[PDB]
Amino acid sequence: GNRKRPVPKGATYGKPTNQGVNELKYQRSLRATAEERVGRRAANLRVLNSYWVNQDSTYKYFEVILVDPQHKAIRRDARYNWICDPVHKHREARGLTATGKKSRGINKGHKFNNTKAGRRKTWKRQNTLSLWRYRK
Amino acid sequence: NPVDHPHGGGNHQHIGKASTISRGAVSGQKAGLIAARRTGLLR
Amino acid sequence: TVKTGIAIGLNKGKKVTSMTPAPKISYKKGAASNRTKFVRSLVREIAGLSPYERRLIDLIRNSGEKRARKVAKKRLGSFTRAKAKVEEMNNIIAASRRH
Amino acid sequence: SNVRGKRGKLKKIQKKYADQDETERLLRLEALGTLKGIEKQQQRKKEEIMKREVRE
Amino acid sequence: SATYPMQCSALRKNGFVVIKSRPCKIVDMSTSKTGKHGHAKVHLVAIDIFTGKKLEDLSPSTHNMEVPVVKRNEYQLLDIDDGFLSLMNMDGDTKDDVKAPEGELGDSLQTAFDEGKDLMVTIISAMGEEAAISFKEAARTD
Amino acid sequence: SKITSSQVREHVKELLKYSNETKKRNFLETVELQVGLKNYDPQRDKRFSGSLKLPNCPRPNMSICIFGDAFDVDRAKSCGVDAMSVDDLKKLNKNKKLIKKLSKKYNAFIASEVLIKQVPRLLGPQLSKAGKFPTPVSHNDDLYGKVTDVRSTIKFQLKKVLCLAVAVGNVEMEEDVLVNQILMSVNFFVSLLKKNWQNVGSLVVKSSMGPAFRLY
Amino acid sequence: AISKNLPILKNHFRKHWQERVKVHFDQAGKKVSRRNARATRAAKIAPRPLDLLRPVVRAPTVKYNRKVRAGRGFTLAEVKAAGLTAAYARTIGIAVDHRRQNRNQEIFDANVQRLKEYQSKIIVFPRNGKAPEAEQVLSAAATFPIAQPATDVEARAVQDNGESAFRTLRLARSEKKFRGIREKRAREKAEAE
RNA sequence: GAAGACAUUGUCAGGUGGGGAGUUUGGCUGGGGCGGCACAUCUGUUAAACGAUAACGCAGAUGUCCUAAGGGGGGCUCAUG
RNA sequence: UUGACAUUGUGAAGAGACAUAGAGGGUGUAGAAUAAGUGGGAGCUUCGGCGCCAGUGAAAUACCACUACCUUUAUAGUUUC
RNA sequence: UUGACCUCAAAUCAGGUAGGAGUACCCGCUGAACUUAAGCAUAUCAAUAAGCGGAGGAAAAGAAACCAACCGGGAUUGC
Ligand SMILES: [Mg+2]
Ligand SMILES: [Mg+2]
């Protein structure tokens, strides 16, 4: 379901464009918050991927694949030892998994001009004022 | 005082609107006779 | 499909001698192989039909392909998928009638 | 039971008036005043016939 | 247009207003100052012409209220059958669209037509709905 | 318009083929339009009533009476149309059997503007009950012209029954005239009808002593 | 606000623009460090020429198709016509682009010729032994410049045959404009019994 | 034990909802309020014999009406005594 | 608060509504009769009989069609409650 | 009776790993109002401030389910 806005008694204290409480939607996916809770449960592991298995009216069910970056079978085996690099701590928390990149909008094309190298990065890049030594 | 109750306020102590309150009323409104089928002293 | 040599018209552009390069293998991604055809036929035999496919079978039997395509367009996304689905269900009806 | 807006009433009787007897039913409708309304509707039918009779 | 605007203070007694999209005829008007500094508010009590219900509204005096166009028209009866009057206009036009009145006016009109008087019927038009209000008898031109 | 001119032309062709050649009748056969309207209530909805004058007359010889004054009766002598005066109507003395006989005698009535007031007072409401009520005529207008007009009148009035019928014309007219008159009558009917071309239950064309033909 | 006869200005400075102001004070120092990086890279790859060989290739749009420029890498068909595999070309310093195609024989021949001259000009060392040092140059692009092709000769004979080159353009535009209606009329004429 | 594919839960849709949120609540003016409109206009006058010219100056008017009460032509002369 | 869809499976009965295939049906009184209404109709005839003039009745009768309202069977029917 | 398998546990079992700090720059979530519109509600401020989660010396992105419509170009990033 949706994300109810956590305000006491529905009062938002602002302009009427921000008075919505009920029909607001979370920007990340249920798959994303599922693997993020799994990563917090096993912080010594690394989240690789996730997949849907089942659902009902109340819950959605996912299975999360995790890899141990301290086990010697992953310290060796050069196909997988890239996960032991410290830049991959909490990929699911930084949105670097498959559904994380899907929710961040990282794709090539004219349909992704807002979100292609990072939405906030592009916003800073096109809201920066660039002044040179010899003013153009 | 009217900040404290629906019945508060006025230059005379009086209720104002009718004191019979709908069952579909919300919290803070249900002060009075809630969902009264009839009122008054029957004889 | 040769160009005309002038800047506007039907086949505008400069005439250059063509080469017709070698075909890329990625252009045949959706091509059906024998092994996947065999797998798809076997799992269709094993699993049978979904409920909307069953009621589509009833709609070709009773109310005709126009109502079948309308219901399949409502059920699936687009009219193209609806036309392909109604065509393959008509094939299932013909094959089961042969059975 | 096949006219409009009757099943909405029939749900409420199953919800809250399933365990009831006719003495209590007559007491509650007399205390709620619907019986007077039923009486006046049948009375209005009676003067609907009666005015035609007086015309004739 | 069917209806035209007016001001509350411009309104006065025995005039027509639109209240809750109903043609209404005013019986009572009362103006009371809101606060000592403020403008007075107009409280209007009116009766629907067709249904007879009592409708009231209060508004600012400077506010504009909607006003219907009411036309009263004079006709002669031809027949009363199935609850629908049949009327006859000057220059010989005939309408049967008017439903017969359902109250004591309708009863008195039915008895008068049964015992055979020549009856003059006043029907009013306001906002696309039509009704009969009163009947007289033609004293001359029998 | 759901109904098409070519379909009207076709159905008129077998209609006139049956009426003229295969089974001819001695009396002149009138072509009838019989309509039934759908999803409509006489009690609640507004009762539509309207009239149109066809260019070529459906019934040339139908009986008409002119209630009239001295000038109207003197003109009616020239017109050749039956008339009774105000003195004659007073003679009648509101006797029900004789006025019922007159109502079954004459299909149509034409009355003067002056006397149309007391036509109900001398004659009563049985004309409104029958549905034949006199049509107004004035001193300025031509009586024989309005006799031709009333003989060419087509009237749709709702009443209580949800089915109507009018006489479009004769069998003996020309095919294009019959097509044009039936098309303009259907157009007039749907113009009177609210929510047009969807509250049309059925349209039937027929000839007198002929089978029905269904146009939608 | 609005005032004397002046043009309407659109200055987008209603955000907190003073939080994002980049003044390039480090232009000169950045240039110096950039030259330092080039020199240390050249010393690290001390015989090799600091950049790969790029193909000549035709610029995309109608505004720029009159010009020719440098591409990303050579086509696999081009390197097979030159007579060496793509992996070997990548190891000896030839940029290979697996995703561009050859539809133009002149561009194909130019790139094959350019690869032939590169293979004639380079020296490839043995992988094990002597390393006969050979005094690097720093720019394969400067040793193989991109040349615009000569499209015509500067003097010819006038060949006039009466079409004015304006009627031709106008008629071509007209037949493109009224193409599809003519096959529509032809189709209904054909299916008219 | 009870209840049972109904409740519950999720998403949409209609109603209700000063319990709560945000905001508004004309101008002229012999102070403001009430009153009036001098707020868009028209005639006569103030107005000082070109034009312009104020006041909550004076006497009034407008938010329409007309297939002729418009256009052309012909004939005739009106109020009153 | 109300409705829909999902959660949501498994079984029996009883009603109702449409599609299109066809059947029959209509009794206040008066009037030769059982008048559902409309509209055409003065000639239709198969009997040379029935209508028409005429009787009664709000409504008139042959010979034509149409439209409702009823009951009535059936479909690899469509469906709702 | 004995021996497996599956699933679930317990150990101060053998060996490991996570938390907190910093946070200028980076990757996300969440999220205003003052202000401007000469009033104000959409809008603007701003996909910003505040709040929360997570990294590195950079991070992120990255080798097309791309751009194009041309004689076509050819991962990403930056000017
Ligand atoms: Mg939630
Ligand atoms: Mg109080």
Side-chain angles (χ1 to χ4, degrees), chain E residues 18-76:
Chain E
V18 174
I19 297 174
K20 307 210 207 272
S21 83
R22 306 286 314 124
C24 306
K25 174 184 185 62
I26 183 179
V27 295
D28 184 36
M29 185 180 288
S30 52
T31 67
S32 59
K33 306 285 294 300
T34 47
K36 13 189 208 169
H37 321 106
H39 340 274
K41 46 171 47 180
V42 178
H43 186 79
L44 295 157
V45 181
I47 302 285
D48 195 334
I49 44 178
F50 300 101
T51 63
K53 292 302 177 59
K54 193 168 53 181
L55 301 175
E56 62 295 348
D57 68 306
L58 74 166
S59 55
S61 50
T62 74
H63 187 67
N64 278 5
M65 301 275 318
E66 183 47 90
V67 167
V69 169
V70 181
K71 316 189 308 293
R72 327 184 294 240
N73 290 326
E74 182 66 26
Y75 298 104
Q76 181 175 357

Side-chain angles (χ1 to χ4, degrees), chain F residues 64-153:
Chain F
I64 294 174
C65 179
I66 308 178
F67 304 141
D69 263 7
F71 181 53
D72 297 85
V73 161
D74 294 349
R75 283 196 299 190
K77 303 161 185 165
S78 70
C79 300
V81 190
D82 291 331
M84 283 74 74
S85 81
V86 179
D87 294 336
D88 307 353
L89 298 187
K90 284 189 173 181
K91 284 342 152 357
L92 301 177
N93 278 317
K94 66 170 68 68
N95 61 6
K96 296 184 180 177
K97 63 177 172 61
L98 270 180
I99 307 296
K100 284 163 63 178
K101 280 171 192 173
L102 293 174
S103 175
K104 302 168 193 303
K105 273 166 196 170
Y106 293 103
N107 197 1
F109 293 108
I110 297 180
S112 172
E113 305 293 333
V114 177
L115 61 83
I116 201 169
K117 281 194 174 181
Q118 70 276 17
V119 165
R121 285 326 279 191
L122 310 171
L123 306 183
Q126 68 275 17
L127 289 180
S128 309
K129 296 167 177 169
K132 323 180 175 196
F133 189 78
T135 79
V137 70
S138 181
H139 290 221
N140 299 11
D141 291 331
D142 290 357
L143 294 175
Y144 195 66
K146 280 193 179 182
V147 175
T148 305
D149 289 337
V150 170
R151 267 163 178 174
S152 54
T153 44

